Amino acid sequence: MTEYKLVVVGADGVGKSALTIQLIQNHFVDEYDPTIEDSYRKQVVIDGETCLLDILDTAGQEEYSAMRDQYMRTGEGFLCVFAINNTKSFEDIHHYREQIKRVKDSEDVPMVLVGNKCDLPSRTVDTKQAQDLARSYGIPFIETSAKTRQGVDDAFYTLVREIRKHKEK
């Protein structure tokens, strides 16, 4: 069975854990332990292919040990998540993309830009801003809500499709 290693990265509080738990459990958590970094497996069918998705939901101290470099280097594609009500989390996307490029030693790593919390009314990052950023990176952009499940399947499945396109060479 085909396995895909997905990694969810981004600032604290953008909804990485809520997105992961929505995908895996079809339920919205109002709180998820900020001390829990972990990987979950989910079997799905994407475009007729039965896959195993291994989803690493990242958390912990900001540290750049060689061990953590190798841990991140195992990821085959990355969801780079910001929240559309938090401009700082959007400005931090550059950082996460650069760190992925660094550990993967490539400018062509499967990535999807995810603007989460799209159910909230207090939007500070406009859609055009995010699509412009994603266009400049050459990656898809998807708006999601872990609360309503809007866009959640599409974000993770689009990442899988990006990994397949990379694997085809």
Ligand SMILES: *CC(=O)N1[C@@H]2CC[C@H]1CN(c1nc(OC[C@@]34CCCN3C[C@H](F)C4)nc3c(F)c(-c4cc(O)cc5ccc(F)c(C#C)c45)ncc13)C2
């Ligand atoms: C509370 C919590 O769980 N986290 C916080 C944000 C994400 C997690 C882990 N921590 C963390 N933070 C940052 O950047 C935080 C900012 C804001 C304040 C100072 N910095 C720099 C920017 F301004 C943002 N980055 C990381 C981080 F890069 C990694 C990590 C580490 C290594 O060695 C490789 C690597 C490769 C690819 C990656 F995507 C990431 C990531 C993420 C990598 N680990 C934790 C980070 C604080």
Ligand SMILES: Nc1nc2c(ncn2[C@@H]2O[C@H](COP(=O)(O)OP(=O)(O)O)[C@@H](O)[C@H]2O)c(=O)[nH]1
């Ligand atoms: N309204 C709304 N709240 C969300 C959404 N995603 C996450 N949250 C909330 O934002 C807070 C932080 O989410 P969390 O998953 O812990 O973010 P993480 O730090 O990136 O893992 C929690 O209270 C979640 O309930 C969303 O799409 N909409």
Ligand SMILES: [Mg+2]
């Ligand atoms: Mg979390």
